[PDB]
Amino acid sequence: GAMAPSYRVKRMDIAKNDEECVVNAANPRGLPGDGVCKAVYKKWPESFKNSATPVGTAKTVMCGTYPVIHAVGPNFSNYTESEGDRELAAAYREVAKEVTRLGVNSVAIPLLSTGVYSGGKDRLTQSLNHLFTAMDSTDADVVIYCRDKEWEKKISEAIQMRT
């Protein structure tokens, strides 16, 4: 575990992370997809061997010895708010299990279901809180990656408000 487990946020490509493993915002079919998923596919294509996994689950595949945790958030275009909320919480719980199992001291994580799976809604708070609920009991350093400047400020504020 990390000596003083922390949360941090960076505004940059998660494919350039400085952590011991990465969480992919995957599709259920293990397809290269778009957004975070496509950047992960370009950086760690080997990790997409038998990466397909259901909504609300996480499946880890090694690129060399570097773990890629394929976490499948719900597409809120397809799910009800209620069911999508449940699956989004579940995907993060499965990430917490994988991070623990791997014995990593740090993990790079995007906000699941906040991009093309958001159903055209701002889910920063919903997704971040489910991330916290899952990861708070882990001792890995968590580094959240985002691309939007205002999202960076809002994530940084939400982290600092609990410290």
- Residue 47 DSSP label: G
In whole angstroms, give the CA distance from residue 142 to residue 157: 15
Scan for tokens 């809002």, then name that residue.
Answer: 154
* From Cl ion, ligand A1AQH, none, interface partner of 152 (C-beta below 5 to 8 A by class): none
Q: Is 13 annotated as a binding residue?
A: yes
State the residue number with the nearest CB to ligand A1AQH: 39
Is residue 146 near Cl ion by the rule CB under 5 A?
yes
Q: Which is nearer to ligand A1AQH, 61 or 146 (CB)?
A: 146
Q: How far is the CB of 150 from ligand A1AQH (least distance, A)?
A: 13
At residue 133's C-alpha, the angle toward residues 43 and 72, to 5°, is: 40
List the x/- string, 14-33, binding to ligand A1AQH by CB under 6 A.
Answer: xx------------------
Q: How far is the CB of 17 from Cl ion (least distance, A)?
A: 10
Say if residues 72 and 26 touch (Cβ distance below 8 Å): yes
The 3-state DSSP class for residue 57 equals coil
Question: Mask: binding to Cl ion, 63-92, rule CB under 5 A, as x and -?
Answer: ------------------------------
Calpha distance 58→87 (Å, rounded): 11
Residues annotated in the binding site for ADP-D-ribose, as ranges?
Answer: 13, 27, 35, 115-117
